[PDB]
Design a protein around this nucleic acid. Structure first.
Lengths: 77, 90, 70, 73, 79, 72
RNA sequence: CAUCCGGGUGUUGUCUCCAUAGAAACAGGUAAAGCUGUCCGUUACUGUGGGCUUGCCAUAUUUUUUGGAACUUUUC
């Protein structure tokens, strides 16, 4: 009975994440937890100049999802 | 148990009402950057999946500059939301 | 949870509290709480102008609690 | 869950905090609150450095995690 | 959880810490908690300014702690 | 000894005037008599006043914003 | 001090009953052995079938994960 469960389906796609801190993060998602803690693969995060990180992982403001992803199919259990 | 009861009667019902009506919404954020879009799905924490979003936010360089950007799909964590305005087209 | 703190040794003794907003208070320790809410009697502000009052300080606020005399 | 978090154990990590400071060192112990314990730590406030030793961070304070190097033998 | 037990094990030794306040405190630790409360003695504070002071007894709230700094032998401890 | 919620229970019966301080705002304070409260420390003040000493004139407060509750 | 009736352990050569892959193939040495090198059986990445060493088991209202944040300005 949570919208979090939908994010566990999301795995594999790339997203630019914004945080409360005010950073921006392009990278592929590997896994998503019930407590929102996401782990990313092949990341390019910017705080300062942008710096690439391999394995990046409360602070999440919003995910800007890719345009190809069908919402109707994922919103079902 | 009691969560089912409040979705029909309470404050959150007007999103369920609006989002089912295929409605657009104006949302005031905690970032000082308002969000104007149409909603897909919501939750008890106000975790909302938005579609076709457009922001409105001032700036300085200096004088006030407004800037807009279109986003296709957007999962918003309800902590960032401070005020929701559920405005109908009709 | 709710570890009732070790303030038994401060009961009925003078104190020098500090609180949020850099404001501080002297008083006789009457009673304490789970959340560290405090009861002080003979409460005197420390602005340096010291005003007598006669007080329940909130737990959240508290930064610390001292002893004037050993 | 926490299956991914055990995989990080005993790797040199780069941890950004809410203050902006960034701690670095191996990971010995981990929590459900994301309390991290770190060995032989070094902050980089920014052209700066400091030596601390064993550091136990809270969950509130932590922002992001990132592996610097592979697990040491 | 282990991140709390390590703390309880450094009771007696001298500890350094950082609060949301911005200041760091250093002293012998007497009691801790699962909340992350603390009880210390002979504390030597040092704020953002550099201002040193002395505090005889102190209690804390964990919520207010950012992070601790613990003695070196506490890395061979059992997990 | 005196626990904290039993202390606030006395302020209801006596109808004593009590000034309330806010969390992150020293510039502002409040006043009023206490009718009722709850487990989460929300308060229903009566004849409440906003206090330069600019006294501006029944409300309810959230328990997250309080710091001090003081008699008279 | 001996003698005698006994025991277990290792190792070697046999005997009886029983087992099915095979890569049990090659070359090095000790007091010993895949001890070593090569080597081969499944196989290192999938889906069906078994077991667990696992999720630790589900908290938006004060000590961590549903925010006191947001914003501005001056100094070097």
């Amino acid at each position: 009975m949570k919208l979090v469960n939908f994010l566990k389906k999301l795995r594999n796609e790339q997203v630019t994440i914004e945080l409360k801190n005010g950073t921006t993060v392009w990278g592929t998602l590997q896994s998503v937890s019930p407590q929102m803690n996401a782990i990313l693969t092949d990341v390019k995060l910017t705080l300062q100049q942008p710096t690439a990180s391999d394995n990046i992982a409360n602070t999440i403001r919003q995910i800007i999802l890719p345009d190809s992803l069908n919402l109707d199919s994922l919103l079902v259990d | 148990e009691l969560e089912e009861f409040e979705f029909k009667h309470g404050p959150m019902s007007l999103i369920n009402d609006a989002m089912v009506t295929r409605t657009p919404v104006i949302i005031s954020l905690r970032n000082n950057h308002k969000i104007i879009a149409r909603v897909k799905a919501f939750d008890r924490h106000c975790n909302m999946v938005l579609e076709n979003v457009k922001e409105l936010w001032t700036e300085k360089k200096k004088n006030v500059i407004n800037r807009e950007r279109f986003i296709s799909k957007l999962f918003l964590r309800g902590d960032s939301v401070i005020v929701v305005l559920k405005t109908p087209v009709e | 949870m709710v570890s009732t703190p070790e303030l038994k040794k401060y009961m009925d003794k003078k104190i020098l509290l500090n609180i949020n907003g850099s404001r501080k208070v002297a008083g006789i320790l009457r009673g304490y709480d789970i959340f560290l809410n405090v009861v002080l009697d003979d409460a005197m502000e420390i602005n340096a102008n010291n005003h007598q009052l006669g007080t329940v300080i909130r737990g959240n606020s508290i930064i610390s609690l001292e002893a004037l005399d050993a | 869950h926490s299956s991914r978090l055990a995989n990080l154990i005993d790797y040199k990590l780069r941890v950004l905090t809410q203050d902006g400071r960034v701690y670095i060192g191996q990971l010995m112990a981990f929590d459900k609150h994301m309390n991290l314990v770190l060995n032989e730590c070094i902050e980089e406030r920014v052209v700066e450095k400091r030596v601390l030793g064993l550091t136990i961070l809270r969950g509130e304070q932590i922002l992001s995690t990132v592996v610097e190097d592979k697990p040491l033998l | 959880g282990i991140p709390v037990k390590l703390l309880n094990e450094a009771q007696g030794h001298i500890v350094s810490l950082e609060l949301t306040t911005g200041a760091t405190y250093r002293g012998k630790l007497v009691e801790s908690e699962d909340s992350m409360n603390v009880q210390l003695r002979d504390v030597i504070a040092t704020e953002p300014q550099g201002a040193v002071t002395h505090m005889d007894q102190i209690f804390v709230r964990g919520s207010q702690i950012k992070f601790i700094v613990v003695p070196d032998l506490l890395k061979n401890a059992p997990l | 000894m005196v626990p904290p919620i039993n202390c606030i229970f006395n302020f209801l019966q006596q109808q004593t005037p009590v000034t309330i301080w806010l969390f992150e705002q020293i510039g502002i304070r409040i006043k009023g008599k206490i009718v009722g409260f709850d487990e989460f420390m929300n308060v229903v003040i009566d004849e409440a006043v906003e206090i330069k000493e600019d006294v501006e004139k029944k409300i309810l407060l959230k328990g997250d914003n309080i710091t001090l509750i003081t008699s008279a």
